[PDB]
Write a protein that binds this ligand. Sequence first.
Ligand SMILES: NC(=O)CC[C@H](N)C(=O)O
Ligand SMILES: NC(=O)CC[C@H](N)C(=O)O
Ligand SMILES: NC(=O)CC[C@H](N)C(=O)O
Ligand SMILES: NC(=O)CC[C@H](N)C(=O)O
Lengths: 400, 403, 399, 392
Amino acid sequence: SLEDLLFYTIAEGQEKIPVHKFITALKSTGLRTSDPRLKECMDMLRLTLQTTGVMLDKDLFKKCVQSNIVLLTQAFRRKFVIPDFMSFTSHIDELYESAKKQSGGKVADYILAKFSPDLWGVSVCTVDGQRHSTGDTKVPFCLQSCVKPLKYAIAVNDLGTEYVHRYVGKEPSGLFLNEDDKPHNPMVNAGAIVVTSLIKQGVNNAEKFDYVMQFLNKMAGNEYVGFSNATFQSERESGDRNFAIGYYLKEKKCFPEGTDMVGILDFYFQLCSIEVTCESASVMAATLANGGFCPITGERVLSPEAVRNTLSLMHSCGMWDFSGQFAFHVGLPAKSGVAGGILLVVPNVMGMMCWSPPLDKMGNSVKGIHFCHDLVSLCNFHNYDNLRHFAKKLDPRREG
Amino acid sequence: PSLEDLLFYTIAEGQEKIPVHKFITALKSTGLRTSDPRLKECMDMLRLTLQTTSDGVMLDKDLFKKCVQSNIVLLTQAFRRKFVIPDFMSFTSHIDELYESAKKQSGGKVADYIQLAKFSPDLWGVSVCTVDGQRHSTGDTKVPFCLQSCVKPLKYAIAVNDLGTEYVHRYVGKEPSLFLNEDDKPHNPMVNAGAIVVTSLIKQGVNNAEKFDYVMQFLNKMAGNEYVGFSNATFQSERESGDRNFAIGYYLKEKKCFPEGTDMVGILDFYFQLCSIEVTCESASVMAATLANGGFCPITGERVLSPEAVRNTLSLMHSCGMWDFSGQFAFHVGLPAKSGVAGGILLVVPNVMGMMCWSPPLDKMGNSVKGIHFCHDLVSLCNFHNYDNLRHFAKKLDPRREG
Amino acid sequence: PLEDLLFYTIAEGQEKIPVHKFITALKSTGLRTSDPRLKECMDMLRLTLQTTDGVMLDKDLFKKCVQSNIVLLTQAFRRKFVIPDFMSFTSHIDELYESAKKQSGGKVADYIAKFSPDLWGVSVCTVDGQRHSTGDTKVPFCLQSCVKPLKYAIAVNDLGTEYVHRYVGKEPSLFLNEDDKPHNPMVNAGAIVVTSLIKQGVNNAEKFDYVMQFLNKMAGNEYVGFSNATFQSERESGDRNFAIGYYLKEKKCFPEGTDMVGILDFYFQLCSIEVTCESASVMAATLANGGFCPITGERVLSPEAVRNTLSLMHSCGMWDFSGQFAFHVGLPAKSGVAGGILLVVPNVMGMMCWSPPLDKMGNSVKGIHFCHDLVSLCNFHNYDNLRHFAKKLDPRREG
Amino acid sequence: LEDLLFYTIAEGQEKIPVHKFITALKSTGLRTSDPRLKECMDMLRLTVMLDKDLFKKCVQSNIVLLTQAFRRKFVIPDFMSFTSHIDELYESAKKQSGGKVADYAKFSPDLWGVSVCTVDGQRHSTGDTKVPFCLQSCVKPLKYAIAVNDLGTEYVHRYVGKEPSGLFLNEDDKPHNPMVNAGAIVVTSLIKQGVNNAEKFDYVMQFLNKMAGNEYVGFSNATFQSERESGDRNFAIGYYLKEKKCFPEGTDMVGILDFYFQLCSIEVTCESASVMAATLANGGFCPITGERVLSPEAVRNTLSLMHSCGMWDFSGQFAFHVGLPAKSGVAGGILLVVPNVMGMMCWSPPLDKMGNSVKGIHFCHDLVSLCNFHNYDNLRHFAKKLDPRREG
Ligand SMILES: NC(=O)CC[C@H](N)C(=O)O
Ligand SMILES: NC(=O)CC[C@H](N)C(=O)O
Ligand SMILES: NC(=O)CC[C@H](N)C(=O)O
Ligand SMILES: NC(=O)CC[C@H](N)C(=O)O
């Protein structure tokens, strides 16, 4: 049987399995024992760890693993999207140390976004739940403009493409507005403000904010999502260009009717002050990598149409004035924000979040931007890499 | 436990003898064509044994072994449904449905400037070549027409393949759009000004006759030696009427955009020539598949282009390939593509297949009405969009799967 | 061998002149007996008409009244004013008025400003004080964007050219030019910045009072008012202007210590200042007269402020029509959305045309037609030649 | 009338020595070579002391122009005083040595000349006023004026715009104005159609001859050949206009470009060009011959477009600060018109970064800071500016 042919894969003709030897075997998969998809099995494990280490014969094991048996077998039969995760991890680690020596860039100074220039984190979450982090991946920071795809996805998920693009375009710019008196795309302030004005119309901005927070919670598999009121208050006083954009959008009747523009700006600053870590945000990115299903809970969070549209606009409009150079050389949908995050999606493989506060002169984190170039020079993750003929690039999706 | 031995019983149901037509029908249902260059030796020994045994058109397990030995590895992938699209017969009928549904779209004007860009507005063909060589066509797939601007990616690929990314893009940019960008470089190689500069990098220091022959040899390899020709009628008329291309040529000279030692008027003559190269949908679809297949021609197995050239060329087609429709196209279709004024759309679905749709009537942006309609429908049906998910794709069909 | 050497010019042999025959002769010059430069002489003339009846002036009853103003009166009667045959010129103004009166296109401004499309007036004030009006010339209307030159003139007069132009550019027209300065003071972003330089370190009530007292000097104290109705509606409908105000703040365009939202309220206020065509024509004549109000003789603006204001009106005055207008008309001009067109003919006269229905560029249909006709008739174009001008009339001439 | 100029010139003295009439004449600003004085200097070359019948025998034919001169009725009455101010202005710009000669014929950076011709024929020069140089883009007004004189405003402006640039073409696929290369090439293709370009060239030369009072107008084949070899941008503009169907039907674009290079290589001096500019200053009448050369509509349209489009990217700053119609050329000339007063030509080859002569541009700023010649100076209240049109 299934649990019986996973007991001998782990027990090497060796009668009973110590608990530490199943847990390391599991963690070697890249899964984390805190995975929400393994709770009942770790529940049954801290349950029988109270009948005091401990060692499991073939029926105590089966009593623990049957409830999660298929997820555990895909894990141990090297059937996950990256079969040799431990080797992949060391490459990610090599990449991390190589970006750490890049000291260019100036921390964002206009608010409050003066962190230390030494912070640098990278987190990975594959579409199968495999996790790895290195550096400062548990330090909270605000999403800033990396929330623009997340809220655009929510708007399309709830209302559909054709309604959303009555109000915002789908192409890069160079004006705020294009020739249809629509903002160019939802990845820029003029576009994201309009998108902010379509989410949950007909409810106050406090209930609106709760809905987006519940939505982001699903997207992160309930990992860390918070709010920084210091950044919200300080975004509010420094948002002169955003008020200019707000009034211009109102004068050009860009919003759906019944909108209170000044309130939408307040809501918009709020969404920009939402806090994440690199671990929690990399999971948000993996939901986008995984067709709308959160990879560590298995629930459908976004329509496949929402995810596709968002991945498309991140590809073409995601990195400010660097997005064309970025699309050419990196070939991955990505979104940078001014706190220094780069939300990065490798479709069908993984999502990631790099964070280092020092920005370059187009507003992208120097260390994150360096990491993304290096990552695609190593692995055939570029969108128009070939999955079969890829020269001397490494491919983490196949065996030895 | 022999390879030729257990492809014999896969095909021999009961029986120890396989009629030859029972092998040929099975072969073609995989989508391979008996003319495939990768099967030539086995097709030769099959017609030879039709000359050396008086009918009794039947293959025992050592007559089978004598014929398929040459190509047994390609043949088992075919018969073990290991090609990128295993149920090709079902997929083709979907292609056919899409063909017929675009056939009812009669908009658009045939190109008026010339010298027979005055084709019939009723010609409409689509050809498919997967990365494993499986082929299907429907409609007018054997009528010659000029590549026009569907040569811009191919020659950029040749230039990058010979010279590298970094040299080529000293001279042309890598982004969508006054002709020149902030660096007095053309915006990208998919627009006339960029393609004129790229044309001026291929095979420098050689006269325009070998320059042409060199590019012609290259397209032949990219097309697995299917039809690649040249229309001197179209060249002569592109030359007389290319007032704007001459304006671009001089502007590029004045802004020193060309390489040292370039003869501008000759480069423009070369440029019109490359625009008058002829294909069909079958031969061009194979060119598209070479780009879909990382640089290896899928029906010959030869490496034609570096994987760096193919990636660069696919990226710019994605962003700059469909004139002013390229953002809408990139959003809704999500595929690398290139339109030309003769009415072709070279189309690449990375890792699966290449296609060439051809219908002469263009819409107001210069794209074939029926081709553009065909491409929306295709991605509405199949999860080929660049950012479709290979695991969660709603009601979309996936031709890469079974059942 | 002076007051009595103008008495014989008016007295036909006769050594006694009836007052109405002096009044008729006076008004034929185009002067108004209400002219502030004639007040004393009209005072001593009504006093004499009180203290005696023989309504007749002997050679010192005349001399007792015109003594005060003898220099202006001799220039008037010796036909030394810029347009000597004013009665004939007037007759031409009337002809042009009637020909524009038959142009009924255009839509009135749709954001109350819903006036009548019937109103149509033109008033003329030469640089010597000669006046003429025809049509609806005493109806109040808001200056709207015809205040942009007047306030720029005030700012340069008080602060100088090179200070003001640290803050606003000087050339025709995305809101900001190549140097993160608005393009010129004749457009909203430029006018908002200019508004933020007038009378700094003062609350918006003295700022408004200061400009109103200034406009009064430019108008020789004819009607200058304020419409709170238009101000409230300018305040409610100014979404685009609120957008411009913030963009200017973000690109650090105001002078330090500016309250941007307050400046916008001042800006809406200045757009709601009210004039007639008569009072405004005098405002225009002040710019036409090198900075001196023509009906009081007072210096209102420095000649440098007037030049800069006239130079920018030429190039930036009529919204997107300013290139065609500068070609075909060649006169400094400024249109407003209430339907006025402030028009200056340098060295000759100022004018104010008013008709609310605007064409698609925001200019009064009738005013624009009047201005083309005027320059086809007279050699007032900036680059008409004063000696060889084909079939054009020259009103500065005694033909 | 002739007898009342005889006593005006003599102290009552006897008769008038001729050298003492010539000095009196030259002090008005008139030049004795003036074509309007041919007959009177003819009658003097026939004849050392003049009583009222030798005087009247010579001045009878020109007595009205001579009394206007001697009764101080010319546009600048105290010309000798004005002249010294021009000299001061010239000397003050002479010390501005920035700028680079155009490197696509290298003249000397030492040359610097200014010549003046009022609308009444009064002339003054300083510096290198007789050294020939090519007009380059200072022919664009002159070539536009000829076209409008012959064809009318509405025909010329089916083909060219009338507003500054800010694409070669505007919203109507017409070039922006005739003061830029794309506009001047179109203007060149309207002059004297239906005649080959050699006769076309002869005609513009005859036209420029009238505009200059038959002073020096020439042609430099060196500049023509070098314009031809260096004109890649002009060849690019030519083809773009052909594709966008901007020329009148029956145009041979490549030939028009050859004509266009020719017109830019026409040679003038500052003296002859100042007369050309004075013709524009004087409503189309040449001031040293009195003939109607251009329609008043052609001249007005030309002055309007020089004002707004004349000084390359400097035309907006220039129109504000100087307020005079002007056109600069890359050989270093600035054709400058003061409507109703005078025409001028400054020439100094070293150009600034916008393509305008450093010394000429300095002179034009200084000239308007000194005199109330700016378009929107007031003729009555002008602060401490000088007015050469008045007596004190
Ligand atoms: N790129 C960013 O993160 C900018 C966000 C910033 N709060 C804004 O809206 O202007
Ligand atoms: N766009 C096409 O398909 C061809 C373009 C055309 N041959 C040109 O060079 O202008
Ligand atoms: N009069 C006009 O042309 C516009 C005036 C108006 N108050 C504004 O600022 O927009
Ligand atoms: N700049 C000029 O005035 C003349 C030179 C110009 N490049 C031309 O010959 O067309």
